[PDB]
Structure 1
Amino acid sequence: IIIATKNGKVRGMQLTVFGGTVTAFLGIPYAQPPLGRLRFKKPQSLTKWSDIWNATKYANSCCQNIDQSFPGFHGSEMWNPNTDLSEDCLYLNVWIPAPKPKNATVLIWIYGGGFQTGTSSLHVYDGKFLARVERVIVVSMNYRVGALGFLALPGNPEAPGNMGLFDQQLALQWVQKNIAAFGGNPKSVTLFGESAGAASVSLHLLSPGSHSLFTRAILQSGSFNAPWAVTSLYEARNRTLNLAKLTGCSRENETEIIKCLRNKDPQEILLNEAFVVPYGTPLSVNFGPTVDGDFLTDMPDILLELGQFKKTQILVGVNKDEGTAFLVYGAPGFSKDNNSIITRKEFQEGLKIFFPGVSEFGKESILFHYTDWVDDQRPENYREALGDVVGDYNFICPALEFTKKFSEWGNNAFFYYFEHRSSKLPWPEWMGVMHGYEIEFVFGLPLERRDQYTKAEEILSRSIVKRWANFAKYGNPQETQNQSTSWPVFKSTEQKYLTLNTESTRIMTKLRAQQCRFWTSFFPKV
């Protein structure tokens, strides 16, 4: 099976899936390798080739620091890259149904990982099940992360910022110019992503250069207005200069800093990224999106507030326990290996870990709003409060606020609350419905009966997959055949959302109302 693309022919491979076939094209390049003088620059267009490019294996993942906090543990290592790290990493994957479709809707996955980690080749991002079950085409790409993807000297084309977001965009461009040759409809393209991938999706809704490259958007546990998602121009320069100091690249001609940073090995850049700030937290994003004047024309909170974004349907949601995953990367008293019951003093110490540059008053106000107990003698009170602090501040309330503000300009929005803990979840039970552990349900992994998921999980995934596909194809995330709960539109007044679980799919209103009034309306003042 050979497909003629605009840059040359590519050969794929056949896959057996659920008694059927899916054609996979793993590792198609979509840009010149950003090497040498191209390091830190926007991705450059790809020159034609005259042979057959062999798209039969995942390509290199982009350079990044690896999680080494729990070596050997599947709960952390399932997120580490599973192909070679290299600056030569601008490749993408395509799964197409067999027989080749006629005008298939296209799903484009953008992975998360805090803009500093991630890769399209992870097992939980394998698009072959969606192509098999729903006959959509699934595209995913690698994009640069960390300083190599987001180092910013505003205005300087040698390091303009947002390079990794331009990587994503050049790949959406690739789908526009090429996907019809695979049987895809370039006019029916839905971006979806999780965590920083969702923040990326939300930023593509804002970027005028992305508006004609997709139709609809899905945002899983992430949005650009989350406190970790956008770096200010002030911090970005301070961090670029700090990186230069730590590498001996300090100059005065700012372009000379970049040239010096271009001769450093990826490792030396990587090992210094952590220290460009004085106080880090487990949620630090030292090198991420900025207002560059190119991808992002203004501070995105202003664009959202004033209606300057692509008018289309969105599907947004969050998981019950977004925050807990980050407590074992720093908060005192927490461990994946015990029940992590903490004291009031440990909670207080945890606030200092997560809100280091916040006034004593600000930190008191968090404690005040999250420690008025329904039972002062319940021992896990402080353990659960800190998880809720971190998840509400960093994920849930920004997603809800994004959805409110987006829906106020007339478009249909749909909001979900994912609350099923995977039966295979390797992390301990006190961490609950963790950040990122809906992804396998979205990609349909529980549909493989060989994988030790329960039967209730197979059916939950099956319904989620149908709802996602119906959203991509038709703008409406319903499951219309198996007498399902109808998913109502999220409006700013009633704020209805759908809960996703194995037991009862219910309609609820005003998720985390009191908590989010604190984070969205009071805490930005402190």
Structure 2
Amino acid sequence: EDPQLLVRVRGGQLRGIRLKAPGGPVSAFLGIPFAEPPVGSRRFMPPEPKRPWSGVLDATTFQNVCYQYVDTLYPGFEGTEMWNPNRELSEDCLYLNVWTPYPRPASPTPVLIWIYGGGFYSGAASLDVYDGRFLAQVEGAVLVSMNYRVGTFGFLALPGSREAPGNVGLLDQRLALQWVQENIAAFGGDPMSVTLFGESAGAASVGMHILSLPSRSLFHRAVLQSGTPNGPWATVSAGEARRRATLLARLVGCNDTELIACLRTRPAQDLVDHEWHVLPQESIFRFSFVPVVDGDFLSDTPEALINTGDFQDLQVLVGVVKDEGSYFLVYGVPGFSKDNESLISRAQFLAGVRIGVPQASDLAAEAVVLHYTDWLHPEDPTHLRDAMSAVVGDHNVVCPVAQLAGRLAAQGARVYAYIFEHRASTLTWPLWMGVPHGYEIEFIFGLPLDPSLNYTTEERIFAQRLMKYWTNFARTGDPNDPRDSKSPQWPPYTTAAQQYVSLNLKPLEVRRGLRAQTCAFWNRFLPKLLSA
């Protein structure tokens, strides 16, 4: 009975496991219930605080993964499997995990909270790339990550109703953060130094906590890796979500009360069968069920909220990876596969834009093609492939990030930006995909430090540097080494200068304008072009 592995949280006692990390041992506390299982009549509803428990609750292992679609594009393939649920699937999945230094911090420690991604239809805290042991050991951090409801279970809404008000996935996230205010001290965490960090939909989630007042007293700083609450994919209008819910009801055989009561009767897997039949539109970033603009959690659209908000006392780290759009190309855009070099024809390129920008009218798509064509080599299949990747990356991530970072700086937030450029040596996707969406996380989390993973010694140093940026940001609001002098400094992103940095193996490099011209195209022109 190791007393370092025993904690008393409000709901009672917990027994963690001692995990080993490369340079020492860490205390883990995996699968802590933070809410009553959102099951049965609770499906679609706001999460409720977990009731207290007798005895010593075992928290030595990861709990179930929230119920979700499992990816079968590339069966057995490491590139995809690594994002797939690695524990049993269950509607009962509202559990968080805590990693702390072993022995537990003598004084209150900066807490990072991870929110995973997966476009609000997938994901799990238990995935290997979010293993919080390294940041716990090396950087002496309290690292927390929670499961939240994805897909229909978490984001299916019939706006304005009692029994499916929507955004409950985001509410799960909030309850985890509430749990952290009330409990993290018991682990050595400092509740007054909480930093949220997340990727893709996790980043957008983080973003939505920035934009929702009730969340704002649960954290102090935020990191948005490769995702935003604004942009084409992160939200839906009240009207449109209601529509999507209704067509799913109809699709499985079902007054709001009545329509929901029916859905609740249905096996979880029945709902997943038709998750991907609610947007018959050949989108890429479909996912039918995403946070809804509800006039509640989201008091207005993110664009609107972002435009008007006051971000006076707020530090934020935002970035993108070199090749956001490559990964998504293989998932429905013709001519793109992991197996060949995917050198597409020009006709395919025009075809792809109609998929990548499904919102685009003929003229709009025309413009996108006009902007992204290299008119010096308009036919070269290499440029058209790389272009297609860019159209998607930029439209869905890079520009939304640029736009967000812009407004936050404008409105008094303190912003740091990066572009992530180093392709992992262990990467199992083809070369042409470059540095794909998702492939910075393994470095931030510190995975190369595990020699058993065969990461190059240079990568193991890079990871250390990134870990030190993140935890430094977490500690102080400033990614920069607070007593190491001349490494080149990471300057804050300002709308004036527009400085970001390249995160790669070469030391920091300051660049200006994050796709300045191209983001101008997406952010200022295209909107005006579609409407009128």
Q: Give the 3 Å change call, closer, same or farther, for CA 27–447 of structure 1 in structure 2.
A: same
Corresponding residue for residue 254 of structure 1? 256
- State the SS of the aligned residue for 1:380: helix
Answer yes or no: is the 8 Å Cα contact 1:211–1:310 preserved in 2: no
Alignment of structure 1 residues 3-42 onto 2, 5 Å: 3-42=7-46
Corresponding residue for residue 202 of structure 2? 197
Question: Aligned partners of 1:425, 1:197: CA distance in 2, in Å?
Answer: 22
Corresponding residue for residue 132 of structure 2? 127
- State the SS of the aligned residue for 2:84: coil
Q: Deviations over 1:100-127 (max 9, x none)?
A: 1020110000000000000000000000
**Residue 142 of structure 2 is aligned to residue 142 of structure 1:** no
Gaps spanning 5+ residues in structure 1: where?
none
The one of 312, 316, 319 aligned to 2:318: 316
Corresponding residue for residue 95 of structure 1? 99
Answer yes or no: is the 8 Å Cα contact 2:86–2:126 preserved in 1: yes
Answer yes or no: is the 8 Å Cα contact 2:129–2:441 preserved in 1: yes
Alignment of structure 1 residues 357-506 onto 2, 5 Å: 357-376=359-378, 378-479=380-481, 480-481=483-484, 483-506=486-509
The one of 54, 59, 63 aligned to 2:58: 54
Corresponding residue for residue 170 of structure 1? 175
- State the SS of the aligned residue for 2:517: helix
Question: Aligned partners of 2:225, 2:359: CA distance in 1, in Å?
Answer: 28
Q: Give the 3 Å change call, closer, same or farther, for CA 332–280 of structure 1 in structure 2.
A: closer
TM-score by length of 1: 0.97
Question: Aligned partners of 2:412, 2:365: CA distance in 1, in Å?
Answer: 37
Corresponding residue for residue 346 of structure 2? 344
Q: CA deviation at 1:308?
A: 4.5
Answer yes or no: is the 8 Å Cα contact 1:408–1:491 preserved in 2: yes
- State the SS of the aligned residue for 2:7: strand
Corresponding residue for residue 513 of structure 1? 516
Answer yes or no: is the 8 Å Cα contact 2:120–2:290 preserved in 1: yes
Corresponding residue for residue 234 of structure 1? 239
Report the RMSD for the aligned CA atoms in angstroms.
Answer: 1.3
The one of 219, 222, 228 aligned to 1:217: 222
Q: CA deviation at 1:514?
A: 1.2
Answer yes or no: is the 8 Å Cα contact 1:373–1:381 preserved in 2: no
Question: Aligned partners of 1:388, 1:484: CA distance in 2, in Å?
Answer: 31
Q: Give the 3 Å change call, closer, same or farther, for CA 474–450 of structure 1 in structure 2.
A: same
Answer yes or no: is the 8 Å Cα contact 1:305–1:405 preserved in 2: yes
Answer yes or no: is the 8 Å Cα contact 1:205–1:310 preserved in 2: no
Alignment of structure 1 residues 181-192 onto 2, 5 Å: 181-192=186-197
Q: CA deviation at 1:330?
A: 1.3
Deviates more, 1:291-300 or 1:44-53: 291-300
Q: CA deviation at 1:136?
A: 0.7
- Amino acid of the structure 2 residue aligned with 1:523: L
- State the SS of the aligned residue for 2:306: helix
Deviates more, 1:407-416 or 1:76-85: 407-416
- Amino acid of the structure 1 residue aligned with 2:353: L
Q: CA deviation at 1:482?
A: 7.5
Q: Percent identity?
A: 53
Question: Aligned partners of 1:453, 1:276: CA distance in 2, in Å?
Answer: 41
Corresponding residue for residue 277 of structure 1? 279
Q: Deviations over 1:358-413 (max 9, x none)?
A: 21111111100000345446440100110000000000000011011011122211
- Amino acid of the structure 2 residue aligned with 1:264: R
Q: Give the 3 Å change call, closer, same or farther, for CA 38–139 of structure 1 in structure 2.
A: same
TM-score by length of 2: 0.96
Answer yes or no: is the 8 Å Cα contact 1:303–1:309 preserved in 2: no
Deviates more, 1:173-182 or 1:407-416: 407-416
Answer yes or no: is the 8 Å Cα contact 1:206–1:309 preserved in 2: no
**Residue 158 of structure 2 is aligned to residue 153 of structure 1:** yes
Q: Deviations over 1:475-504 (max 9, x none)?
A: 100135384221001001110001011124
Question: Aligned partners of 2:292, 2:241: CA distance in 1, in Å?
Answer: 7
Answer yes or no: is the 8 Å Cα contact 2:312–2:411 preserved in 1: no
Q: CA deviation at 1:446?
A: 1.0
Answer yes or no: is the 8 Å Cα contact 1:229–1:285 preserved in 2: no
Deviates more, 1:390-399 or 1:154-163: 154-163
Q: CA deviation at 1:429?
A: 0.3
